[PDB]
Amino acid sequence: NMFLYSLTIQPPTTITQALLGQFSGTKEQQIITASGSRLTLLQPDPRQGKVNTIVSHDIFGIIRAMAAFRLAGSHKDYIILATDSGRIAIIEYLPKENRFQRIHLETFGKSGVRRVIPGQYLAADPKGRACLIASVEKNKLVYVLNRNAQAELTISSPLEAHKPGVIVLSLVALDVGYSNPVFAALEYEYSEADQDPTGQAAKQLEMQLVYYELDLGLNHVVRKWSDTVDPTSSLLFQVPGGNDGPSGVLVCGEENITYRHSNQEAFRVPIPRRRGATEDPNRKRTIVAGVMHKLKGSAGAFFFLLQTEDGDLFKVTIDMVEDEKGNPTGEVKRVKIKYFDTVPIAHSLCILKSGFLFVASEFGNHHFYQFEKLGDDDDEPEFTSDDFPADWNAPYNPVYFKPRPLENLVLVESIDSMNPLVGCKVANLTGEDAPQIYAICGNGARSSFRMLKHGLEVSEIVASELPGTPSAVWTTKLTKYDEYDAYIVLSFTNATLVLSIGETVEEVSDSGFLTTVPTLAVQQMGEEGLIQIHPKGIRHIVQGRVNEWPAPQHRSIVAATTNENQVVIALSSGEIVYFEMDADGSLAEYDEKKQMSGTVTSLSLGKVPEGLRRSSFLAVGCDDCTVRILSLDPESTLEMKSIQALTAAPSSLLIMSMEDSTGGTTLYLHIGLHSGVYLRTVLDEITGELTDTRQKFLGPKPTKLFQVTVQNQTCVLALSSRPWLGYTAPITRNFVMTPLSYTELGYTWSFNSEQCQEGMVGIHANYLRIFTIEKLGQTMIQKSCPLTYTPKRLVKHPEQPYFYVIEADNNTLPPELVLPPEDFGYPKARGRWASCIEIVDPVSEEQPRVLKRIELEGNEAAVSAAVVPFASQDGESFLIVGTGKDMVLNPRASTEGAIHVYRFIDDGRDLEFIHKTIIEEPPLAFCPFQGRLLAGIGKMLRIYDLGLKQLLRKAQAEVSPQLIVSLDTRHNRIVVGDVQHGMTYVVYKPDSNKLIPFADDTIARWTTCTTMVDYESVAGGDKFGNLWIVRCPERASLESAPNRLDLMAHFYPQDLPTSICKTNLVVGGQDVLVWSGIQGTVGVLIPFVTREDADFFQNLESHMRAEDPPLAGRDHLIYRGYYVPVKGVIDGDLCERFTLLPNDKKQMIAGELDRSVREIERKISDIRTRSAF
Amino acid sequence: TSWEWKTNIHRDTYSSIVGHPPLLSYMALAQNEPVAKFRVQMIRKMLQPVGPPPP
Ligand SMILES: [Ca+2]
Ligand SMILES: [Ca+2]
Ligand SMILES: [Ca+2]
Ligand SMILES: [Ca+2]
DSSP, rough: OOOOOEEEEOOOOOOOOEEEOTTTTTSSOEEEEEETEEEEEEEEETTEEEEEEEEEEEEOOOOOOEEEOOOTOOOOOEEEEOSSSSEEEEEEEETTEEEEEEEEEESSSSSSSSSSSSSEEEOOOSSEEEEEEEEEESSSEEEEEEEOSSOOOEEEEOOOOOOEEEEEEEEEEEETTSSSSSEEEEEEEOOOTTTSSSSSSSSSSOOEEEEEEETTTTTTTEEEEEOOOOTTOOEEEEEEOSSSSEEEEEETTTEEOOOOOSSOOOOOOOOEEEEOSOOSSOOOOOOOEEEEETTTSSSSSSEEEEEEEOOOOEEEEEEEESSSSEEEEEEEEEEEEEEEEEOOOOOEEETTTTTTTEEEESOEEEEEEHHHHHHHHTTSEEESSSSOSSSSSSOOOOOEEOOOOOSEEEEEEEEOOSSSOOOOEOOOOOOOOOOOEEEEEEEEGGOOEEEEEESSSOEEEEEEOOOOOOOOOEESSTTOOSOOOEEEEEEEEEEEEEEESSSSSOOSOOOOOOSSEEEEEEEEOOSOOOEEEEETTTEETTTTTEEEEOSSSOOOOEEEEOOEEEEEEEEESSSSEEOOOSSOOOOEEEOOEEEEOOOOOEEOOOOOOTOOOOOOOOEEETTTTTTEEEEEETTTTTTTTEEEOOSSSSEEEEEEEEEOOTSSSEEEEEETTTEEEEEEEEEEESSSOOEEEEEOOOOOOEEEEEEEEEETTEEEEESSSSSSEEEETTTTTTTEEESSSOOOOOOOEEESSSHHHHHHHEEEESSEEEOOOOOOOOOEEEEEEOOOOEEOOOOOOOOOOOEEEEEEETTTTSOOOOOHHHHOOOOOOOTTOEEEEEEEEEEEEEEOOOEEEEEOSSSEEEHHHHHHEEEETTEEEEEEEEEEEHHHETTTTSEEEEEEEEEGGGGEEEEEEEEEEEEESSSEEEEEEETTTEEETTTTEEEEEOOOSSSSEEEEEEEEOOOOEEEEEEETTTEEESBBEEEEEEEETTTTTTEEEHHHHHHHEEEEEEEEEESSSSEEETTTEEEEEEOOTTTTGOOOOOOOEEEEEEESSSSOOOEEEEEOTTTTTTTEEEEEETTSOOOEEEEEESSSHHHHHHHHHHHHHSSSSSTOOOOHHEEEESSSBBBBBEEEHGGGGGGGGGGHHHHHHHHHHHHHHHHHHHHHHHHHHHOOO | HHHHHHHHHHHHHHHHHHHHHHHHHHHHHTTEEEEEEEEHHHHHTTSSSOOOOOO
């Protein structure tokens, strides 16, 4: 009883943690990142200044913490994962197989994110001897990591260090050299606060820094040392230990940094305050992230980069007393803070040994910087513990600094991140076959409007006029040892043109008067000679000496395929003539010719398999809608091996060997039909029969096939109304056909040159072009433009290609009333809002552009939006905006709400403010309802009409239990999403002008988005990371608190859904549900066509659950049913991991499912490409 | 019910907010505060989310 298939179009782009390590085993460094549930391994490239993704793996769990450690006498780091599985998992990366593999998995508790079950915190000893995993309260477990005789990893049983009432804010491992491992923790005990009945014992925090020493000798853990620290202390940082420095932890709290070790005195330094005019003076700041780095080739030589809540980076250093000579001692003297540079706020920062800084932004794009570092060295004031008071309560004088643009750092890459994804809509603003996905994301001045288009990114190098419309192109080498192919040839309806490498070209050889059907240089290992076949003969050209095969009959040449050692032509009579090559002379024509029942429409010879003399197979398509495979072996030349009938006449054929999903090349026959169909079949390589057919529809134009090379991979380029590239995906290893974001082409060929290699050449409508597909794998192209504030909603003009975004940054004063806000942030101010409207034009130009901004005023913030037509205005659609004044979220504070009304002017490129009408609370939901406006204010459902000076009430009622957050409607039915109590079905009674609620949700749901799929059911998501579909029972549906909605589907994507809609993503027209997630996911739910498909994907999902369990030890069925059990949804993200298995597993699953491996592959690809992309 | 019961319910809720990165990012973004700072606020709230206990 399954009916939905969940797929991921775009994986999350957030990075809650990035970590550096030699995970490949080489001395090179790599970055491991946690993106929600994806574990991703990235390779920084110091030459190109970019960072490339090595691999990604869906944990099917929640990655809460990651630690790295090295075994003694080894150069390879292992990854410890703290997740929600209740288990500790230790995994390793395998560069030979390009896959993650876990080397340990041990259960320590029950599954989930719970208070008293470790997983929240994880730290590892710097020397790799042990690690500690802990919860917020109160459990801690220490696992000892050792090396066995086999030189493999051994794990002891955990050691308990529990202590009730203890709350942990931070946890880092001490670097004690090779002494007994010690773990530091910021803790506070609530045991006293529960005992004081009135008064407290609260409003105060007794924060302690605690040391947990692990005695390897006695194999136990004890609270060795502890002391009181600043109550505002929130972060700990590891300072180098042993010989590289004195062990210890920087304790970071409100305007406080302290060294604070057990065998050292205290050393306090403040956090400088911004000195800007907009910046509030005497505003204390805290630390949000930080890095420690030890410089090579020198003892000590370590510094810190710490980040303020504004994003400002300060460099911290430690100076220790010197002896009589000029040498350091163990005693510490001072701590020095110096302003470094301002970067976006980050979850993690990473300093690479190659001199780079990787910034994992908490929101917005990620940043890759290169160090310099020029200050000027002492241009920035420096402040030390001399003599700020080690006591946190002791008075002291504030210290200020002036922020400024980048001096020590240079930005080298900005990495596209759709985090945080506030919302998206699916619409087709161009004539293109596929609708686009428009999305609003980012935060602050780094927010953005982004459009996603399904296609492959290609860069055009040259273009030129011809000017006559050419009908074909080729590129060809005169000599088989030239790395750069010499010539470029063009063909017209009555002439032929010849070009070559360089800036300009003309003619020296070849026949330029007549049309040319193909061109190839036959003789590999024989320099001299090209062939130009044309109607009425085959011209063989060799160092200027020309010898031609006559036609010679009244018949002419209608088709031809060429190979290195072989040539095949088809005449108008239907005869096929075959030419092989002797030691000298391409005229070794076969004594006999093969007659065909009808006219030949396509020919494909296939390249010469290396190590062999010739290709053994020839593909012949005819007008009788048949494709045959004829043999070319000497013993049985031109005998028919196989035959297949086709839906339409074959317009093109192409034999080609490609990498397969099972690790070895396979010989395929690509077929292009006159109806726009593309097929890929398997050529048996011996019996020559065709099996395992794949189909796709590309466009109304007849499809044509060519062989190109992209990223050192041989790919098929199919030309239809659009160009499609068929290739084997580099990471996921399946076979993909993705369209090109490029013009329609009528002909294309592989191209080479000194300037570009493995490029391509093509023609269209009086134009020739040279392009290359620089990088594949990324099937979604993204164009973006910045916005002003953090988006909130997105609405589209009902008739014109324009969007309207409402934006609101909380706790920010209006920028006014010299520092770019995207680089340094708007000036913060408590309780003040900054909000605005922006009009976005995404298609009219090459890039999306913001046409106009409408700034709000009066501490007023936009919270909702809709485009509503009003019957009273002859159906004109207006822009409805909801706002609030003096908004405080927790607790919710109502000064006043408002509804602005705007009017579309200049076809939607601008707005005219009509009137603003004040209401009690901010309206969180609008909805067009029967030619009038529906608004949700508080628990109140209200119908407004458009009046001369205000919006006018016409009906109202209380419908939801606490707060309206979404609205939708069909006919007389209104569905109301409550902030906490799920769905509420209301019905409107026209004769009575009453809004009556008649259905409500069974369980609580913290609704975040809704849509109506039909009259009876609603699909939505909630803030705990759930997607669901509820429906009205059939007995209560005829009634036009009392009745309970039925649960029709539920699923845990883990990412928080921010928007959802029903739409069509492909011309095929399968209605799908598209949704977006806060962490960047863009996902689809696809309904199954037949019960057989539902059964196949359910059983496939089961076997994938058995043979590919979640990496971190989760149970996939329990994971996808985190809060309530799974109902109705199959996880296609798991199914699509079938391609990654070893072949024995694939064959086993193929056995249980009673389908071939290639069949399973084809159905997996098919369900995705047919209904979405 | 008992002050203890409410206190546990709130502490579990704060723990869950800190535990699930998506929810934490959602709330912190709504408040326009850094995620680490919001995390610290939530963990700090665990001391006494409701009123002091009865005598
Ligand atoms: Ca093979
Ligand atoms: Ca801007
Ligand atoms: Ca009020
Ligand atoms: Ca594999």
